[PDB]
Amino acid sequence: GMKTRLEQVLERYLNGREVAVWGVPTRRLLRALKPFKFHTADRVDPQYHYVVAVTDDDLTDFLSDEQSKSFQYANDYLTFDDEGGELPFERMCFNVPVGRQTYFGDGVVGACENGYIKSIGQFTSINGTAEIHANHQLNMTFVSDDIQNFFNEESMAVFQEKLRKDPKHPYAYSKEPMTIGSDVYIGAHAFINASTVTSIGDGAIIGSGAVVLENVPPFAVVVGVPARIKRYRFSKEMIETLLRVKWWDWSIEEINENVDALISPELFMKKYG
Amino acid sequence: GMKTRLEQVLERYLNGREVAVWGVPTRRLLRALKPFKFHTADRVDPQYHYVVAVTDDDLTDFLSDEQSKSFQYANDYLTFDDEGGELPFERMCFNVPVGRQTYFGDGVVGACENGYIKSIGQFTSINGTAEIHANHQLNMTFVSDDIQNFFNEESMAVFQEKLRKDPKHPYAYSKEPMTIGSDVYIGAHAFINASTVTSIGDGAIIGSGAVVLENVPPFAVVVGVPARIKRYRFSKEMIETLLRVKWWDWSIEEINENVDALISPELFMKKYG
Amino acid sequence: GMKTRLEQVLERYLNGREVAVWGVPTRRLLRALKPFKFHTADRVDPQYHYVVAVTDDDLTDFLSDEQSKSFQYANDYLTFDDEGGELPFERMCFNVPVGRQTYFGDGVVGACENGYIKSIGQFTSINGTAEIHANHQLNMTFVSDDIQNFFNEESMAVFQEKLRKDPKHPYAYSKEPMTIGSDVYIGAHAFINASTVTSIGDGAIIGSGAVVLENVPPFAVVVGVPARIKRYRFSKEMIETLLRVKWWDWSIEEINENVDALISPELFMKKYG
Ligand SMILES: NC[C@@H]1O[C@H](O[C@H]2[C@@H](O)[C@H](O[C@@H]3[C@@H](O)[C@H](N)C[C@H](N)[C@H]3O[C@H]3O[C@H](CN)[C@@H](O)[C@H](O)[C@H]3N)O[C@@H]2CO)[C@H](N)[C@@H](O)[C@@H]1O
Ligand SMILES: NC[C@@H]1O[C@H](O[C@H]2[C@@H](O)[C@H](O[C@@H]3[C@@H](O)[C@H](N)C[C@H](N)[C@H]3O[C@H]3O[C@H](CN)[C@@H](O)[C@H](O)[C@H]3N)O[C@@H]2CO)[C@H](N)[C@@H](O)[C@@H]1O
Ligand SMILES: NC[C@@H]1O[C@H](O[C@H]2[C@@H](O)[C@H](O[C@@H]3[C@@H](O)[C@H](N)C[C@H](N)[C@H]3O[C@H]3O[C@H](CN)[C@@H](O)[C@H](O)[C@H]3N)O[C@@H]2CO)[C@H](N)[C@@H](O)[C@@H]1O
């Protein structure tokens, strides 16, 4: 096993408090909360309770309740069914590190569990609808994957070592897990092909509906099906500066002391050129 | 707060009856039903009970039950988790008016809550899969939105007034909310860009998968990514007639007395040309 | 009524055992399990219990539990909310036969209930995100379908027989239900138009995001919006051999005795040319 998003938060911030469950629990959540005292949330006080909304619909009910004016996000509450949500600290998602202020949808965390990704960067914004799938094998008479359920030991072996010896890397085998940089935007209905992409450059923008079939260089704004660059983010000199200064690894104080360097693209250039 | 779809229906049609809950309640639903007598649905009689299916899967179970032969849609039953469903009367959806016989999916109601839309017309058919998102800011060194969580008062102010002064209207700021006309069809996997669209013309057809990036004139059938017209609905003289006669604002009696004007496009033209 | 996926499995494999419910039941599931003894799963033994995970999230919890090491898929457990999941035997899905090792998502089973499909083949792999919708009527002044809710008997009749007399087959009327062959791959965000497609050839590959608007001949690899062939699977002589040998109708013993005929495309050709 390994820790879920909620478990990681509770480790940090629960601080011996009781867990006030806001919503109908699921068996998975009840396994998580088994070591703690917990109860169906009634009257709640952040000094004594940490509130776990089960679903995002359960969260909206809580935040509409006057009782939640005192609760601070992450420190005092969290949604349980939200493994790919943003956090103010670096977290883990099935041995995939993801930085701060970084969210994604069920498709991506799904890809994380499969191991299609090695890391997601900082301040990265991925739409819920986006999907990341590998490709099936093209070298054989079949493309069905679940035919593998019918194979014995002997058929499994001969099938499983033909996949390992493949250039086009089916099922994301034989390749490095994908790497998604910081300050990336991925739009709705998008697709990144895990069998052929190894890295998405920092600050790259994927237009919505676009279908990425190969690595996107840093700051390449890409649309259309498949994905070709229509515009770059900034000048190539500005690109190479951002990759050394690494403002996304900054502290919070460094963000609020160099605000207007971030707000103005070329005001930044004077300071870190 | 403001009234949900269910609350609006119950106001109209509950008429002092008890609410028979068909399904496992959610905390959000239980907040809604708090003022009324309600119970886990067992034997139900529309003379005494109004049946609220919690989920759409709960609804199918009810409609398969022989007990539901006597219940009429809206008047006697409704799904709770169905904020974007059709209704025989004009309704509200987060201060967004939507006409009669008009449905949409979770993406659109999501856009409604954000305020990306000003109104949805009558007899409008929007696929569940469709999504409506704004664009992030392109004028800065970053595109991440949730970096805003790290800003203090002072950083928030300088960041928030640069957005207000923007031509491309990021986050749907500084622009009129979108307006969706009557008799519109939007297909599956579609996308309308809330940062750049202000109005979708009445009777416009969005082909599925199409990505609308700018206003669609009335009756423009549009496909492809992005969205360009491949065909118009009717002749331009027929277009300008429909915009004055406004058959979608008709009564029910006017629909059933002028049936074959609606069924035949050019039979309509003789009456209202 | 007709039998769901779970009911069909339980008929085959329950064998007088008790149903151990792993998760929060739904009213629909509780209707299914009404004839059997069943209980909230605690300590479970496949000799005495069949475990029904309600949701797929409930399933992952079960499979992470050490108690599930003894349970075999289908024979001893199954997800309830998974009507379009793979099975080792041919099954039914709303009078739509689907072969072995064949899965699809909520869109397709949705299309099945509508009757847009006549059969799904063997070893067919359809992404969850794929959608299958018919087209609305284009012959009239309106495209809204739910305006039909406002029609009386008389308006319904004149409206319903104009649809039956249509070349473009709106609402999948007047046409054969769609047929999906064996060994088909359909990718994410895809769309097959039920109003214009009658058959997808065996072994056809639909690239993800592609929008199929007309029949795909066997083994045509198709991408882009709309869907045009960029490559065929195998040589046209190999195509016509696979359609007679029909390896997807094989037994399991025939799969494991002719493994390397399936793994190697042209090694197959020597045996069955
Ligand atoms: N507020 C509407 C809510 O949105 C939900 O999720 C969708 C979307 O809104 C939601 O928004 C995501 C959240 O996830 C995540 N927790 C924080 C992130 N900043 C936010 O960002 C997203 O929505 C922001 C609106 N602040 C937009 O500014 C931003 O453009 C967009 N990327 O992510 C989903 C993407 O598709 C549900 N769709 C809807 O039912 C619900 O009501
Ligand atoms: N009947 C199948 C059901 O469909 C559900 O939702 C999908 C679709 O079917 C459903 O259908 C919508 C409903 O929403 C809404 N309440 C009324 C509207 N007339 C209807 O319309 C939609 O389905 C009609 C089939 N009358 C089609 O005639 C019409 O082309 C299509 N726009 O909207 C969703 C769009 O994607 C679930 N996908 C599936 O699980 C369920 O079983
Ligand atoms: N393992 C991740 C899980 O995936 C889920 O569903 C998605 C996907 O993964 C899932 O996978 C389907 C299953 O359905 C179905 N029961 C068996 C089938 N062999 C499998 O196949 C799919 O995932 C396989 C990963 N073996 C891939 O090898 C294969 O390329 C892909 N078609 O189908 C969905 C397609 O979109 C959820 N998205 C996620 O929450 C969950 O955690």
Automatic annotation (TrEMBL), chains A, B, C:
Annotated CoA 2 binding sites: 135
Residues annotated to bind CoA 1: 127, 135, 185-186, 188, 208, 230-231
Binding site for acetyl-CoA: 127, 135, 185, 188, 208, 230-231
Domain of life: Bacteria
Binding site for Mg(2+): 253
Keywords of the record: Metal-binding, Plasmid, Transferase
Record: residues binding CoA 3: 168, 185, 188, 208, 230-231
InterPro entries: Trans_hexapeptide_repeat (IPR050179), Trimer_LpxA-like_sf (IPR011004)
Keyword Hydrolase among UniProt keywords: no
SUPFAM superfamilies, alphabetized: Trimeric LpxA-like enzymes
MF-aspect GO terms: metal ion binding; transferase activity
Keyword set includes Repressor: no
UniProt-listed Gene3D superfamilies: Hexapeptide repeat proteins (2.160.10.10)
The name this protein goes by in its record: Aminocyclitol acetyltransferase ApmA
